[PDB]
């Protein structure tokens, strides 16, 4: 459950 950006990937 990290606070990473779930939409970081441009592809």
């Amino acid at each position, epitope marked *: 459950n990290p*606070n990473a950006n*779930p939409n*970081a*990937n*441009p592809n």
Partner: antibody
Amino acid sequence: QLVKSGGVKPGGSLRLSCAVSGFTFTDAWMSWVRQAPGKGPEWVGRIKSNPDGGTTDYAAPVRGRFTISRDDSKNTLYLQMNNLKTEDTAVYYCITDRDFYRSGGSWGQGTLVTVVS
Amino acid sequence: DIVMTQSPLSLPVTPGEPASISCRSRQSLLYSNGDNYLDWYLQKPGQSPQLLIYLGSNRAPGVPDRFSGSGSGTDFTLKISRVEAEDVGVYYCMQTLQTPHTFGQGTKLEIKR
């Protein structure tokens, strides 16, 4: 496309502005990173997009002194630096993830902040 | 914090020869959607860092095919199939899974001309 501007003594303040061009800033999460001379980069803080809550996270050495904000009207990211320390001296960069991965390239020129006493 | 460890710290390589750099994390960088939240950078002398690989294995635009990124979870590898003179600089890993975002200590590549 990023252009950093606005970059000074111990205890004083300085505001960095990073005007963004080349993608839709409103939907981009943004980070400040810095690199003191002779050392590797160090993450300073991040601000989510306002549609995702627009909340902020800060590196421990700057928590309580620095404030990150954004004006989506101007496609501009800000770093308000207060109560500056000499150890804050570094080149500061504004970065993002998805739009940067898509375009490639470097972090740009960055702006040197020298805390002088 | 997530400590990132890079190996080796210094990497002398003869032009044309292959180079491999390792970055190891204490915490898995695998996110719930299958992506690994690790980027690879090159900082050429006097320049700002340049993105080489994003999210584990995606070669960024403008990067020659000589560069490739592999790995998953806690162990990642940047590979340079053939080293050129322009490749000299300091290579950095960077995890973005969890704040504070953190960087490897850096790997200085040295061209053995």
